[PDB]
Design a protein around this ligand. Structure first.
Ligand SMILES: *[C@@H]1O[C@H](CO)[C@@H](O[C@@H]2O[C@H](CO)[C@@H](O[C@@H]3O[C@H](CO[C@H]4O[C@H](CO)[C@@H](O)[C@H](O)[C@@H]4O)[C@@H](O)[C@H](O[C@H]4O[C@H](CO)[C@@H](O)[C@H](O)[C@@H]4O[C@H]4O[C@H](CO)[C@@H](O)[C@H](O)[C@@H]4O[C@H]4O[C@H](CO)[C@@H](O)[C@H](O)[C@@H]4O)[C@@H]3O)[C@H](O)[C@H]2NC(C)=O)[C@H](O)[C@H]1NC(C)=O
Ligand SMILES: *[C@@H]1O[C@H](CO)[C@@H](O[C@@H]2O[C@H](CO)[C@@H](O[C@@H]3O[C@H](CO[C@H]4O[C@H](CO)[C@@H](O)[C@H](O)[C@@H]4O)[C@@H](O)[C@H](O[C@H]4O[C@H](CO)[C@@H](O)[C@H](O)[C@@H]4O[C@H]4O[C@H](CO)[C@@H](O)[C@H](O)[C@@H]4O[C@H]4O[C@H](CO)[C@@H](O)[C@H](O)[C@@H]4O)[C@@H]3O)[C@H](O)[C@H]2NC(C)=O)[C@H](O)[C@H]1NC(C)=O
Ligand SMILES: *[C@@H]1O[C@H](CO)[C@@H](O[C@@H]2O[C@H](CO)[C@@H](O[C@@H]3O[C@H](CO[C@H]4O[C@H](CO)[C@@H](O)[C@H](O)[C@@H]4O)[C@@H](O)[C@H](O[C@H]4O[C@H](CO)[C@@H](O)[C@H](O)[C@@H]4O[C@H]4O[C@H](CO)[C@@H](O)[C@H](O)[C@@H]4O[C@H]4O[C@H](CO)[C@@H](O)[C@H](O)[C@@H]4O)[C@@H]3O)[C@H](O)[C@H]2NC(C)=O)[C@H](O)[C@H]1NC(C)=O
Ligand SMILES: *[C@@H]1O[C@H](CO)[C@@H](O[C@@H]2O[C@H](CO)[C@@H](O[C@@H]3O[C@H](CO[C@H]4O[C@H](CO)[C@@H](O)[C@H](O)[C@@H]4O)[C@@H](O)[C@H](O[C@H]4O[C@H](CO)[C@@H](O)[C@H](O)[C@@H]4O[C@H]4O[C@H](CO)[C@@H](O)[C@H](O)[C@@H]4O[C@H]4O[C@H](CO)[C@@H](O)[C@H](O)[C@@H]4O)[C@@H]3O)[C@H](O)[C@H]2NC(C)=O)[C@H](O)[C@H]1NC(C)=O
Ligand SMILES: *[C@@H]1O[C@H](CO)[C@@H](O[C@@H]2O[C@H](CO)[C@@H](O)[C@H](O)[C@H]2NC(C)=O)[C@H](O)[C@H]1NC(C)=O
Ligand SMILES: *[C@@H]1O[C@H](CO)[C@@H](O[C@@H]2O[C@H](CO)[C@@H](O)[C@H](O)[C@H]2NC(C)=O)[C@H](O)[C@H]1NC(C)=O
Ligand SMILES: CC(=O)N[C@H]1[C@H]([C@H](O)[C@H](O)CO)OC(C(=O)O)=C[C@@H]1N
Ligand SMILES: CC(=O)N[C@H]1[C@H]([C@H](O)[C@H](O)CO)OC(C(=O)O)=C[C@@H]1N
Ligand SMILES: CC(=O)N[C@H]1[C@H]([C@H](O)[C@H](O)CO)OC(C(=O)O)=C[C@@H]1N
Ligand SMILES: CC(=O)N[C@H]1[C@H]([C@H](O)[C@H](O)CO)OC(C(=O)O)=C[C@@H]1N
Ligand SMILES: *[C@@H]1O[C@H](CO)[C@@H](O)[C@H](O)[C@H]1NC(C)=O
Ligand SMILES: [Ca+2]
Ligand SMILES: [Ca+2]
Ligand SMILES: [Ca+2]
Ligand SMILES: [Ca+2]
Ligand SMILES: [Ca+2]
Lengths: 388, 388, 388, 388
């Protein structure tokens, strides 16, 4: 109908309720489920669906051998019905590639997939399921993007891309698209020193993205975008509650405009909701590996370099595998506010479970509740031994 | 369009005709059919579908081992096309959880799923396929609900919940929802001493629910709800024709306001249609186990403590496994009356058939006919030996 | 929109072109294809689909053992997309039973399924995918119907049923339905001595049905129905070109009002298009078994007791298995005439191929052309040895 | 709505971006994927889909043995969602046959399938998913058509057919269809000496088809059609950059009105975009076999007998199997120009890989970009050894 506008603020997050779970790895042990990774969730005005990068083979298939690898010509962004697993028969291909983002602007959906060799990748921007614009690699070193949904406001859908080193300065750009066409792009500004895989959401005409500083930061960089002025700023979450992984132990004071040191050249896609006292941070429980997952209420985390938790909720036990996590919201729901949601990728197989030759995942997803709900843990649930 | 109103009375039940059957266990021996239990049927204005709690694995899958268990993080309420089996590829997830109810109000559908550990469960109420309201456990002891469809009248859809002991007094509440929001709730009143898994239907602006007194009753408790006044009453079916299971043999006089003694701490979800002489009771043939199933016409069963059968119809032979049963009707059919329908869950596997490591079921469903139709029996039809 | 009226006459049949083929048995050797038999084809105003009686198991499934049997509680009328095979995932259940018919009246579809034990069967008539009317067995001996589509005119859809002996006089009735309700029924009249499985079509406000005289006739009985007056007549095809099976060799003169003798208590569902010189008869090539299939142009076959072929077309070689055949037409196609079509059931497995424990089939379907097209043969195509 | 008119010219082709890829053979190693060959892509106003000739069996199925054969009664034109593989459950049958073409005229789709024995084949023309016209073989020697989409202009959809020898003069006809009916047909004219499998596209009210001269030409014949006047011309691509296969090495000067000699009685379906300097030719890299695939910009290739490449892009490495290739465009996309697209059939199995008993393929597809995008190679990706 009309372009969606970010007119509401976030609902008060007092806890998290279960939203979706596909149990993909459990089910795929004996059904035609595609091997995936880098999943996310994204809503259309009349439907919310799961998204991921397929590896172009089923989990039980012999071609599952080697799926720990990230970029092959057999990957594609696929989407499928909420909480169903990504099967050969119910998965819809949005575009071909090994890095992606996607979002609905209220009228139709824009999907972006990047493909190609490391030194010659290109992004193809799809709108209304048709290819509209293409962008060639500018730094010739793995052009890559969010791996979770973008956000739109009055037709303008900003997207964060990075091209260049994963272990030193890179070239990050913020592109402002409208109907799949480039309105404007700008180089990253602010104090964030390295940017990868931004997790974004919008409220009251502003888009907030929590990203990954792969190079040096154990705290997470934050990009705030004005989609009307088509400008942005960047900084780090000030709070000493560190949310990347691996990471050093939590200090008593964090860093606002520089990466918090201790771990270099590594990380994990993550997210946060930065809204004053209504601030919640997600993170793996383990500081060493993609193990466990918890939500922590950290009032003013973004601006308070001494902020610590006041409430929390465990999502995945430290005795279970987690992985990527990101933000999304149903911008077309009823009510006076946007209900914060997130998903956690539950990685199974390599490298942590190397008795199998594949690497895949399942998805668990939650949204906020104004109630103070009891908590449960949500593991992938598959028994690797069954696959041996 | 407009909210449905219960303006018609029940059609005269002179017999039962076959409505649906999915032969899920037979088919799933060699196709990707999900393991389920606690099924039911529910209609939308333009379609009627089967519903159940998936176990998040196929029957032939190795993860089917252990599906006798009731509450895991891998369960979800799913729905699929009438008489088709619940497959990985045709099952639509309504919400995540291990106890549920669902009903269409004429405009859209409300679905409720409860999840969590025994002492910290929560219900999430979905409306128009979006999460709208959440309710935390109030007694911290397996918050649970109907396991069959709810019923709506002018937008108000009452739902019966129980939290607390299964072997002593518990805390039952009747929630009145409208568009997924809580209008009102009240604690159970009347003479019913324990309430679980209510099976409901509506006619002439009144909703009748036949439930399960797990604690002490072999006769079934009944809750009658006024969805306009949002009030209710409760009692037991007076008739000496006992319908829970296990149960003692039938006496010559029943109990109207107290559980009929003989069997404690056990039961099975069941149902009835209480309409004067047009009263029909469903029950397992066996008084000891979930074996066989029959419909018995027992005029004034609800109010006559000496009422006995005047007609009957066998649905499943005592030599075949049955299980849960419940009520539903197509409130959007043509005609001057609502045609009473019901389903019977045909449980296969554990605990009765322990040569296999799983527990699942198939569904058989019937609706009333004004004719006096010949009867047939309707077994699950699978050969367990094939699964060995 | 509006009820369809049989306002056109048949197009001139100069040959037959391939319309549909599902290769179900070939494909099902390695995919989840349901075991079926008694198939047919039927059109809706916007789609034509394949129909059949499922056996409630896949062909490769262990429950395929024994599917030679006709009436079990695991059968159902299913429909699926034209030329696709009937799979677990794409088959839509129309109703439960082991004998059926179905037809669209222009507004919506009526489907009829009969189920039950031999002495207590009942038909349930569905309209707009809801059960509307039920008819109890009147002769208590396998109530049964067409096994191919019915035909409608201004809302009135006549259907031929038989109840009673398959080897002596039986009780045949013609029911006139409108919106699933019974307008009228009448007992069979005319000279046809036994009636089973009528294959019907309509043109110029008249419905012609070619049926099966199981008791004594090797020539086929014919019922012509006036759906406005709701009356009919019956006789036999006069032509000496005999079309039932098994049957004696062709004589030089046939019988118009009595069964042509030579073979008793057996037959096969078949069809014909009786339109003056534009008359075409279908039949198995073998006079002994359901082997091969051919179309023969026999001018005035219905009324000329000496009529012989003037043209022909082979559909299935005598070295290949055939089976049931029946008529259907797309009453909603463009043009000035109705294009005659038919399907042939290609039975595989028992009893002819007993190395396998199952019985199933695939479908081949043709429609007429005003051209004189070259002919090909259309076998099922599966290799039984592959199933061993 | 209204018939589509070819009102736009081609967009400037500066490179090719990835459009679709189904990885069918990889996925089908462990899922129910149909064996196919002769694929293509074609758009409807609201969707673009993959098309191919199924072999009526899955790849893992035992009936895959022998699928190197071209014309059996088990083949059919099927279509399925873009970039999904052709599975038993998602493939829609358009018609039955072993040679086809299909195209949308803006209102609805016309599909054509030819079937029958070599000396008695016939084409059936479907419109709006209904059979409308039939054409009998005129030369009684494998009536055959494009194997890629046709193109329409104001309702007129020309189609090129050939009947007769593959190794000497044959009888080629251009049929002009409108709503599935024959408006006119004409015999091939011009200097093209043999015509097979034309690959066509339209722009500015003209349809250009690049075909295959199986008899003698290593350069490709070209048919240009005026769909309004319903007339055409034919010639050969003048350029010395030869594009059929097998073929002799590239000379310095080609032939404009005669086949370039060196290879007889063989070839491969191919295509080109002939638009002045914006001219791009597709071809296998190998001159001996269907190995590799590249796009070459050859300004004025059609008219310049000395034209050589000025730019290029590799699509499939010479170390990987290719096969058929053809043109298609989304005539309903936004913008001021038509974006040239093509697909390449990646054949796997026999005859090149004879360790397996089958022959199948997967699809890769690209469209043009006005950018100068980095290139990647796109192999089928399956490991034959896995199928052993
Ligand atoms: C039924 O359900 C309800 C609803 O969920 C359950 O109630 C919930 O219970 C939760 C567990 O107790 C609780 O979550 C905790 O909340 C704490 C905050 O609340 C407390 O502090 C405030 C502040 O003054 C008070 O107002 C409040 O009353 C409480 O006292 C958090 O601080 C907790 O998080 C910390 O602990 C967990 C371990 O439990 C860690 O995993 C987590 O990361 C936090 O601790 C680390 O980080 C801090 C910050 O830097 C450090 O100070 C600390 O040392 C830890 O650091 C190590 O570990 C991290 C992670 O590995 C590593 O990076 C670092 O380097 C160090 O090694 C926790 O979030 C919910 O708030 C509560 N909800 C409600 C509504 O009450 C109820 O129990 C359930 N019922 C039953 C019967 O089970
Ligand atoms: C073709 O199809 C038609 C249509 O279905 C077939 O006709 C049907 O036939 C059915 C079987 O005969 C019949 O069903 C029975 O109806 C009886 C009621 O009708 C009779 O009584 C009235 C009352 O005066 C008369 O008007 C009427 O004319 C009849 O005489 C029921 O009473 C029957 O139910 C009881 O029996 C069955 C066993 O058959 C039990 O399973 C059932 O639970 C009932 O009996 C138990 O319960 C009562 C009540 O407390 C006790 O008194 C009794 O002792 C039993 O108790 C034991 O068992 C239970 C269950 O295990 C346990 O809990 C308890 O503790 C005790 O151990 C039965 O329902 C249909 O009405 C009839 N329909 C029609 C339209 O005619 C026809 O036969 C078919 N044709 C062929 C050729 O097959
Ligand atoms: C390319 O394609 C075209 C298009 O299809 C091919 O041309 C077609 O060729 C067909 C085969 O020749 C032909 O079909 C035959 O037509 C005959 C009728 O035409 C002839 O007679 C008339 C009458 O005067 C002439 O006008 C006309 O010119 C012809 O001469 C039919 O009579 C044929 O059917 C009979 O033969 C077949 C065997 O081929 C039987 O299976 C069939 O049942 C018919 O014969 C039985 O029945 C009759 C009637 O009672 C008996 O008299 C006879 O003895 C047989 O009885 C035995 O067998 C039956 C069945 O088993 C059993 O029940 C009984 O008891 C006995 O045992 C046949 O239909 C098409 O018309 C023709 N089409 C066109 C447009 O030309 C062309 O060949 C192809 N090209 C190539 C190169 O292959
Ligand atoms: C990142 O991505 C970009 C974008 O893709 C990459 O840049 C691309 O690089 C490509 C490879 O270098 C390049 O493709 C080539 O372009 C040549 C044309 O450009 C050149 O010539 C013009 C003309 O004066 C100049 O303006 C221009 O500056 C260049 O110098 C083509 O000629 C090339 O094709 C020929 O070579 C390939 C082998 O590489 C053959 O496979 C192909 O068939 C062509 O050669 C055959 O045919 C000709 C014509 O008859 C014969 O003369 C020749 O001998 C060959 O004949 C043999 O082989 C054929 C085929 O087997 C056989 O039939 C025959 O009989 C003989 O045996 C080639 O197309 C892109 O244009 C370029 N794109 C851009 C935008 O720059 C960049 O490299 C990537 N970056 C990295 C770091 O990898
Ligand atoms: C989001 O905000 C913009 C207003 O800036 C709205 O876009 C007006 O919408 C109407 C209805 O289609 C048009 O007549 C105006 O020209 C629109 N655009 C502008 C840029 O002024 C848009 O309607 C809002 N979205 C929603 C859902 O209300
Ligand atoms: C089939 O024939 C009957 C006419 O007997 C048509 O039914 C008239 O249709 C209009 C349009 O809905 C109504 O106003 C009349 O009352 C209809 N019925 C009768 C019984 O008179 C019907 O329209 C015809 N079907 C088609 C497709 O034309
Ligand atoms: C485009 C690409 O390959 N992205 C990969 C990502 C990057 O390798 C990482 O962010 C460093 O640049 O890492 C991870 C990862 O699991 O850490 C997965 C992504 N597939
Ligand atoms: C929420 C829950 O676990 N409900 C279970 C139910 C209860 O255990 C029973 O009603 C006693 O409370 O029993 C049964 C049962 O088969 O008896 C199945 C239900 N899964
Ligand atoms: C209802 C029923 O069982 N109909 C069967 C039919 C009858 O047995 C036959 O027409 C005699 O009555 O025969 C055949 C048959 O193959 O001859 C199949 C049908 N399933
Ligand atoms: C109708 C038909 O059989 N067409 C076939 C085609 C022809 O054999 C070829 O064009 C020569 O006529 O060749 C090829 C081929 O791979 O070369 C495939 C087609 N199936
Ligand atoms: C099929 O069933 C028969 C009868 O029960 C049995 O003797 C036979 O061995 C079975 N065949 C298979 C393959 O199970
Ligand atoms: Ca980091
Ligand atoms: Ca399988
Ligand atoms: Ca009880
Ligand atoms: Ca007979
Ligand atoms: Ca050639």
């Amino acid at each position: 109908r009309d372009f969606n506008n970010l007119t509401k603020g976030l609902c008060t997050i007092n806890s998290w309720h279960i939203y979706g779970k596909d149990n993909a790895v459990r089910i795929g042990e004996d059904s035609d489920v595609l091997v995936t990774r880098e999943p996310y969730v994204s809503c259309d005005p009349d439907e919310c669906r799961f998204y991921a990068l397929s590896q172009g083979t089923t989990i039980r298939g012999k071609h599952s051998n080697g799926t720990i690898h990230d970029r092959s010509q057999y990957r594609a962004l696929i989407s499928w019905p909420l909480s169903s697993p990504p099967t050969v028969y119910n998965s819809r291909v949005e575009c071909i590639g090994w890095s992606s983002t996607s979002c609905h602007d209220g009228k139709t959906r824009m999907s972006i997939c990047i493909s190609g060799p490391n030194n010659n990748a290109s992004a193809v921007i799809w709108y209304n399921r048709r290819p509209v614009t293409e962008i060639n690699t500018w730094a010739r070193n793995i052009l890559r993007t969010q791996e979770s949904e973008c956000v739109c406001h009055n037709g303008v859908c900003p997207v964060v891309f990075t091209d260049g080193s994963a272990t030193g300065p890179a070239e990050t750009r913020i592109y402002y698209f409208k109907e799949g066409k480039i309105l404007k792009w700008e180089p990253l500004a602010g104090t964030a020193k390295h940017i990868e895989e931004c997790s974004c959401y919008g409220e009251r005409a502003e888009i907030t993205c929590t990203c990954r500083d792969n190079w040096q930061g154990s705290n997470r960089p934050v990009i705030r975008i004005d989609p009307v002025a088509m400008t942005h700023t960047s900084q780090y979450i000030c709070s000493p509650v560190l949310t990347d992984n691996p990471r050093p132990n939590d200090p008593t004071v964090g860093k606002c405009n520089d990466p918090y040191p201790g771990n270099n050249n590594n990380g994990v896609k993550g997210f946060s909701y930065l809204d004053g006292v209504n601030t919640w941070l997600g993170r793996t429980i383990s500081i060493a590996s993609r193990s466990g997952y918890e939500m922590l209420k950290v009032p003013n985390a973004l601006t308070d370099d001494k902020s610590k938790p006041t409430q929390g909720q465990t999502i995945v036990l430290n005795t279970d595998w987690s992985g990527y996590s990101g933000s999304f919201m149903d911008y077309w729901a009823e009510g006076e506010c946007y209900r914060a949601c997130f998903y956690v990728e539950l990685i199974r197989g390599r490298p942590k479970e190397d008795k199998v030759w594949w690497t895949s995942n399942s998805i668990v997803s939650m949204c906020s509740s104004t109630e103070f709900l009891g908590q449960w843990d949500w593991p992938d649930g598959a028994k690797i031994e069954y696959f041996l």
